[PDB]
Scaffold this active site. Structure first.
Site, PDB file in Angstrom:
ATOM      1  N   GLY A  93      -6.830  -8.889  -0.360  1.00  0.00           N
ATOM      2  CA  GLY A  93      -6.201  -7.580  -0.398  1.00  0.00           C
ATOM      3  C   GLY A  93      -7.088  -6.525   0.265  1.00  0.00           C
ATOM      4  CB  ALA A  94      -8.653  -6.004   3.096  1.00  0.00           C
ATOM      5  CG  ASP A  95      -2.511  -3.267   3.798  1.00  0.00           C
ATOM      6  OD1 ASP A  95      -2.777  -4.070   4.704  1.00  0.00           O
ATOM      7  OD2 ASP A  95      -1.368  -2.684   3.663  1.00  0.00           O
ATOM      8  CB  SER A  96      -7.020   0.769   1.267  1.00  0.00           C
ATOM      9  OG  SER A  96      -5.796   1.461   1.038  1.00  0.00           O
TER      10      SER A  96
END
Length: 77
Positions: free
Chosen positions: A33-36
């Site tokens: 989870g790396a959308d920021s």
């Protein structure tokens, strides 16, 4: 060299995770989870580590961590 062994960390921290689940073939982005704090961070890190404003265009290829290595290595090999 002390580029990859550290890369994992960068992704292990930048993305914000533990220092174990970090591998060399995991699409942290979706996988984890790396959308920021994916590239926006990894970039800086991978950047400070040397100097390479990993553009999203190319960041989409480093979705994982290894790519981030073979990338920093594919530049200065």
């Amino acid at each position: 060299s002390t580029i990859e062994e550290r890369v994992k960390k960068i992704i292990g921290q930048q993305l914000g995770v533990k220092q174990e689940e970090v591998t060399n073939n995991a699409s942290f982005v979706e996988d984890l989870g790396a959308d920021s704090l994916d590239t926006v961070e990894l970039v800086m890190a991978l950047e400070e580590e040397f100097d390479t404003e990993i553009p999203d265009e190319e960041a989409e290829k480093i979705t994982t961590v290894q790519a981030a290595i073979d990338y920093i290595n594919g530049h200065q090999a």
